[PDB]
Ligand binder design. Sequence first.
Ligand SMILES: Cc1cc2nc3c(=O)[nH]c(=O)nc-3n(C[C@H](O)[C@H](O)[C@H](O)COP(=O)(O)OP(=O)(O)OC[C@H]3O[C@@H](n4cnc5c(N)ncnc54)[C@H](O)[C@@H]3O)c2cc1C
Ligand SMILES: Cc1cc2nc3c(=O)[nH]c(=O)nc-3n(C[C@H](O)[C@H](O)[C@H](O)COP(=O)(O)OP(=O)(O)OC[C@H]3O[C@@H](n4cnc5c(N)ncnc54)[C@H](O)[C@@H]3O)c2cc1C
Ligand SMILES: CC(C)Cn1cnc2c(N)nc3ccccc3c21
Ligand SMILES: CC(C)Cn1cnc2c(N)nc3ccccc3c21
Ligand SMILES: CC(C)Cn1cnc2c(N)nc3ccccc3c21
Ligand SMILES: CC(C)Cn1cnc2c(N)nc3ccccc3c21
Ligand SMILES: [Zn+2]
Ligand SMILES: [Zn+2]
Lengths: 228, 226
Amino acid sequence: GKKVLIVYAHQEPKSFNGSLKNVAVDELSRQGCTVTVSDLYAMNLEPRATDKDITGTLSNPEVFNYGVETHEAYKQRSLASDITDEQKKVREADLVIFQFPLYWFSVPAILKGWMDRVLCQGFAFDIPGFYDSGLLQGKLALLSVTTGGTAEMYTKTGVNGDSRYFLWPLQHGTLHFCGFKVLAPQISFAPEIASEEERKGMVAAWSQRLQTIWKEEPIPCTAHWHFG
Amino acid sequence: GKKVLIVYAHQEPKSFNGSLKNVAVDELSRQGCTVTVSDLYAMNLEPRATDKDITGTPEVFNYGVETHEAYKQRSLASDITDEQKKVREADLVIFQFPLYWFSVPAILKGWMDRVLCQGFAFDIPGFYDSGLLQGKLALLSVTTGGTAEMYTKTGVNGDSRYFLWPLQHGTLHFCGFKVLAPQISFAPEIASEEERKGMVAAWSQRLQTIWKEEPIPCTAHWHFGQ
Ligand SMILES: Cc1cc2nc3c(=O)[nH]c(=O)nc-3n(C[C@H](O)[C@H](O)[C@H](O)COP(=O)(O)OP(=O)(O)OC[C@H]3O[C@@H](n4cnc5c(N)ncnc54)[C@H](O)[C@@H]3O)c2cc1C
Ligand SMILES: Cc1cc2nc3c(=O)[nH]c(=O)nc-3n(C[C@H](O)[C@H](O)[C@H](O)COP(=O)(O)OP(=O)(O)OC[C@H]3O[C@@H](n4cnc5c(N)ncnc54)[C@H](O)[C@@H]3O)c2cc1C
Ligand SMILES: CC(C)Cn1cnc2c(N)nc3ccccc3c21
Ligand SMILES: CC(C)Cn1cnc2c(N)nc3ccccc3c21
Ligand SMILES: CC(C)Cn1cnc2c(N)nc3ccccc3c21
Ligand SMILES: CC(C)Cn1cnc2c(N)nc3ccccc3c21
Ligand SMILES: [Zn+2]
Ligand SMILES: [Zn+2]
C-alpha cells in the first residue's frame, strides 16, 4: 500500500498537462495506490511567502525573517492551514509527482510558491538534515514537465542547453536538499508542436512508465549527472 | 541620463536585502540616474498566471496563447502593463532578492511569468540575441543562506553559476537582455557585523562604476566551461 501525492500546476483541465495528471490518477488508482492531487490553480494556492503564513504573534514582529518565523511556527504548530494541509499530504506520501509546464526554465510561480511555503525548516530540512539526510529521506519525487521547446533544442550543442541543466535547481537544489530520492524526469517535449499521434505516444509512454514506477532506481542526483 | 528599475523581492525593509536595495537607490540617485523600485511584496503583486490577466477584447484556456494575443490587443491587466512600461523605459534592471530554492522567490517568479509575455519580451522568432529587450542590461543581486565554499564544484551546493543559468540565460538573455556579472552576497545571516558592512560597501562601490562595465557573454561556456 503506497501513497502518492500529485502536485499539479495547470490552469486548464483539458490541457496536455491536465491529461498527464489524469493518466497518473487513473493508472495509480487502478494499481490500488492511495492518490491525492493538489490542484494548485483550482485551490488558488497563495504563492507569496508572507507573515500571514504564521498564525498569531510572531517571534520578532519588528524585523520579519520569513525563514526564522516559519521554522518557529512549524515547531509551535502555528503555520497557516493551507501549508499544514500540504505538509500532511507530503508526510504521508511515498511518492510526490510534480506535473507542470516549463515556465522560464523552471516551475510556474504558483508551484514555486508551494515549494517555498510548504518545504519549511523543521518539516523538510533542518541543520543538520539536508541532502541525503533531509527530513523527507526515503520518499520519492518525480518531475513531469512539458515544454515549448523540442528535444533537439535541449541538447548540449543547442541554444537552450541540455534539459538537465534546468533540472538542477528543482532536482538537486530543492528535492534532493529535502532528502527525496529523485526518479528520472518525465519530459514531454513540445506537445503544442508535436503531431496528434506523437502526443498520444507521449501519453502512452507516461501511462506505461507508471505501471512499473515502484521498480525504478532513482537517479544519482549529482552535479556530474546534471552537467557532465 | 540613465534609467534604472529595481525589482525588489523582500518582505522586510530592514533586511540585508532592504539594505542592498536602499544602497542602490541612494547611490544611483546620487549619480543623477532616474530610479524606480517595484517592491513586489508591498505591491502584493499577483504571482499566478491566470485568465484574469486578460482584461477584455474560450473553451480551452492556453495562458501563453491568450496573453500573447492580449498584449497585441492592449488588453493585459494593468499590473502587467505598468511593469512593462517600467521595463521599456529602463536602461538597467536590477533584481534584488534572497535565493529561495536555488531560484527567485515565487513573487518574483510571478513577475517574470506575467510581465515577460510574448510580443513584449520576446517573439518566435525573436529570442536570445534577437530578444525584444535588446539594448537593455539586467543584473541579479542575490543573497544566500549558503556560504561561498558551499557554492563550489566540491561544495554540497555546486557552483553558483549552475543556479544562475535558468535566470540569466533561460529568462534574461532569452528576452534579449545583456547580463552584467551577478552580485552574490553569500550568507549575510552567518557573517559578522563587519563582514556584512563589507558586502554592503562592496555593492555600493561597484555601483559607482556600473555604467562602465561590460556585460558577461551569456553562454553555456561561461556558466559551465571549467
Ligand atoms: C510564462 C511562460 C513561460 C514559458 N517558458 C518556457 C521555457 O522556459 N521553455 C520552454 O521550452 N517552454 C516554455 N513555455 C512554453 C510552455 O512550457 C508550454 O506552452 C507548455 O509546456 C505546454 O503544455 P500545455 O499542457 O499547456 O499544452 P497544451 O496547449 O494544453 O497542449 C498541446 C496540445 O495537446 C492536446 N492534448 C491534450 N490532451 C491530449 C491527449 N490526451 N492526447 C493528445 N493530445 C492532447 C491539446 O488539446 C493541445 O492541442 C512557457 C510558457 C509560458 C506561458
Ligand atoms: C523558502 C526559502 C528558501 C530558501 N532557499 C535557499 C537556497 O536554495 N539556497 C540558499 O543558499 N539559501 C536559501 N534560503 C536562505 C535565504 O536565501 C537567506 O535567508 C537570505 O538570502 C538572507 O538574506 P536576508 O536579506 O533575509 O538576510 P537578513 O536576515 O535580513 O540579514 C542578516 C542580518 O543582516 C542585518 N543587516 C541588515 N542590513 C544591514 C547593513 N546595512 N549592515 C549590516 N547588517 C545588516 C540584519 O539585521 C540581519 O541581522 C532560503 C530561505 C527561505 C525562506
Ligand atoms: C508558449 C509556447 C507556445 C511557446 N513558448 C512560450 N514561452 C516560451 C519560452 N520562454 N521559451 C520557449 C522556447 C522554445 C519554444 C517555445 C517557448 C515558449
Ligand atoms: C527612510 C526609512 C524609513 C528607510 N530608509 C532608511 N535609510 C534609508 C536609505 N539610506 N535609503 C533609502 C532609500 C529608499 C527608501 C528608504 C531608504 C532608507
Ligand atoms: C549614506 C548616504 C547614501 C547618504 N544617505 C544617508 N541616509 C540617506 C537616506 N535615508 N536616503 C538617501 C537617499 C538618496 C541619497 C542618499 C541618502 C542617504
Ligand atoms: C544550509 C543553510 C545554512 C543554507 N542553505 C544552503 N542551501 C540551501 C537550500 N537549498 N535551501 C535553504 C532553505 C532555507 C535556509 C537555508 C537553505 C540553504
Ligand atoms: Zn542532488
Ligand atoms: Zn545566455
